[PDB]
Amino acid sequence: MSEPASLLTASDLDPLILTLSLILVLISLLLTVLALLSHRRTLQQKIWP
């Protein structure tokens, strides 16, 4: 590689918080997508019901 093996050996700076974060991140993202589709679906119906 080109970076110090320390950057990887230190990938454990905080896995506990990262895990909880990744979860909320992935979840929050999914929630947004759903809300987006739901809104788009409603508009379509309201446009041509």
Curated annotation (Swiss-Prot):
Coiled-coil-forming residues are none
Task: Pinpoint the Glycyl lysine isopeptide (Lys-Gly) (interchain with G-Cter in ubiquitin) cross-link.
Answer: 46
Record annotation: effect of changing residue 2 to T: No loss of EPO binding
Q: In which tissues is it expressed?
A: Expressed in relatively mature erythroid progenitor cells and in EPO-responsive erythroleukemia cells.
Localization per record? Cell membrane
Q: How is it modified after translation?
A: The identity of the C-linked hexose on the WXXW motif has not been determined. It is probably mannose. On EPO stimulation, phosphorylated on C-terminal tyrosine residues by JAK2. The phosphotyrosine motifs are also recruitment sites for several SH2-containing proteins and adapter proteins which mediate cell proliferation.
TM stretches of this protein: 16-38
Its domain description in UniProt is: The WSXWS motif appears to be necessary for proper protein folding and thereby efficient intracellular transport and cell-surface receptor binding.
Give the record's subunit note.
Answer: Forms homodimers on EPO stimulation. The tyrosine-phosphorylated form interacts with several SH2 domain-containing proteins including LYN, the adapter protein SH2B2, PTPN6, PTPN11, JAK2, PI3 kinases, STAT5A/B, SOCS3, CRKL. Interacts with INPP5D/SHIP1. SH2B2 binding inhibits the JAK-STAT signaling. Interacts with RHEX; this interaction occurs in a erythropoietin (EPO)-dependent manner. Interacts with ATXN2L. (Microbial infection) Interacts with friend spleen focus-forming virus protein GP55, leading to ligand-independent activation of EPOR and to the abnormally rapid proliferation of erythroid precursor cells.
Any extra remark in the record?
A: Viral promoter integration by Friend spleen focus-forming virus (F-SFFVP) in the murine erythroleukemia cell line F5-5, results in aberrant EPOR sequences and EPOR overexpression in erythroid progenitor cells.
Q: Report the sequence similarity comment from the record.
A: Belongs to the type I cytokine receptor family. Type 1 subfamily.
Function as written in the Swiss-Prot or TrEMBL entry: Receptor for erythropoietin, which mediates erythropoietin-induced erythroblast proliferation and differentiation. Upon EPO stimulation, EPOR dimerizes triggering the JAK2/STAT5 signaling cascade. In some cell types, can also activate STAT1 and STAT3. May also activate the LYN tyrosine kinase.
Q: What is this protein called?
A: Erythropoietin receptor
Residues included from the entire protein: 236 to 283 of 507
